[PDB]
């Protein structure tokens, strides 16, 4: 299906503590494959996914120098923004960027990204047409006018449709087998007491991958999406994910409810019910 290559970059100023902390993370289909962290005696891009060690020492040297170059630009950018927003040199600020492309199953570009944020708020972004810019505030307008004059949008469109896509194709074919990895969830229902004549049924989905999943509770075949609680999907820490959804039901009516688990790893959705140990 549709795939993507994106870099999530962060620069955080640390006045009075040292140089800004600079981090660049590369993703292929929401999976981290490379990372550069300036917090090292000799920082360099490092592989984060096995299939990347297939690249030669020339690739890493080049990427590393490019990241060191961006670290410098961001260092300057942090100073520039202190001016644009009339802020002191004693506070910590953050600059973030999401740069990348998404392609279709035919390998062609579906959309490119290049968006900035200052202290957690949108700053400037390249529009879908890949020619114009959307500034978030007055400070961003100064940047917009510079980039419009220098033809920055044109430079990015060339990178997005060319370099970005070409390398994504290369990556996708090197990690395809790994990227298509699938781990089905194992589910079960737990029973918990509630004040008075009610009880809670909690449906667990454990050890699945990727994180995308849907859990539902039905009462006699109808989906119950109102008074149903659920937690955000969370990492188990071993590469797989967890999630649960619960509903409060009348004591003695547990058999009227069924849990449904939908995940791309399953041959078909899982259907479960509370099972009192015989």
């Amino acid at each position: 299906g549709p795939h993507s290559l994106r870099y999530f970059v962060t620069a955080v100023s640390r006045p009075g503590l040292g140089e800004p902390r600079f981090i660049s993370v590369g993703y292929v289909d929401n999976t981290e494959f490379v990372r550069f962290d300036s917090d090292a005696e000799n920082p360099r891009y490092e592989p984060r996914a096995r299939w990347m060690e297939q690249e030669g020492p020339e690739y890493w040297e080049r990427e590393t120098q490019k990241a060191k170059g961006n670290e410098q630009s961001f260092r300057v950018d942090l100073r520039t923004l202190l001016g644009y927003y009339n802020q002191s040199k004693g506070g910590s600020h953050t600059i973030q960027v999401i740069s990348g492309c998404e392609v279709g199953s035919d390998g062609r570009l579906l959309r490119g990204y290049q968006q900035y944020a200052y202290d957690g708020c949108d700053y400037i972004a390249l529009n879908e047409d890949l020619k114009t810019w959307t500034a978030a505030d007055m400070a961003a307008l100064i940047t917009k006018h510079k980039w419009e004059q220098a033809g920055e949008a044109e430079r990015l469109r060339a990178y997005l449709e060319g370099t970005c896509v070409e390398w994504l194709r290369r990556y996708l074919k090197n990690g395809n087998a790994t990227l298509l990895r699938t781990d089905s969830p194992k589910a079960h229902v737990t029973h918990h007491s509630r004040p008075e004549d009610k009880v809670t049924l909690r449906c667990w989905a454990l050890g699945f991958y990727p994180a995308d999943i849907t859990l539902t509770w039905q009462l006699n075949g109808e989906e119950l999406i109102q008074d149903m609680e659920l937690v955000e999907t969370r990492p188990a820490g071993d590469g797989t994910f967890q999630k649960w959804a619960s509903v409060v039901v009348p004591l003695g009516k547990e058999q009227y409810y069924t849990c449904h688990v939908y995940h791309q790893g399953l041959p078909e959705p899982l259907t479960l019910r509370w099972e009192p140990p015989p």
Binding site: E32, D37, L206, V231
Partner: protein, 100 residues
């Protein structure tokens, strides 16, 4: 400046069973700025050996990270995750609930 309050989840990697070694997690998401202080507690006392994953950020710009420690649950021991972040006046303590 702008700040986002961290959301916290405390839970085990494996179904908790008294006496059997496990791993306790403190998943912290949706916060900004990135500077954050995370401590895990056992019966109110800070746990020394607590590992931290690398920090990352999502599409909405907010950061997330996972802190974890080895532990062997019992019926009476209490665990919690305490987070200090500029978005909150005081540190936030979330207790581990075996059923969640």
């Amino acid at each position: 400046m702008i700040q986002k309050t961290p959301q916290i989840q405390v839970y085990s990697r494996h179904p908790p069973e008294n006496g059997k070694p496990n791993i306790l997690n403190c998943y912290v998401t949706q916060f900004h700025p990135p500077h954050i202080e995370i401590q895990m507690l056992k019966n109110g006392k800070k746990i020394p050996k607590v590992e931290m994953s690398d920090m990352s950020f999502s599409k909405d710009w907010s950061f997330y990270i996972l802190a974890h420690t080895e532990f062997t649950p019992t019926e009476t021991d209490t665990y919690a995750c305490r987070v200090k972040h500029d978005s909150m006046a005081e540190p936030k303590t979330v207790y581990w609930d075996r059923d969640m």
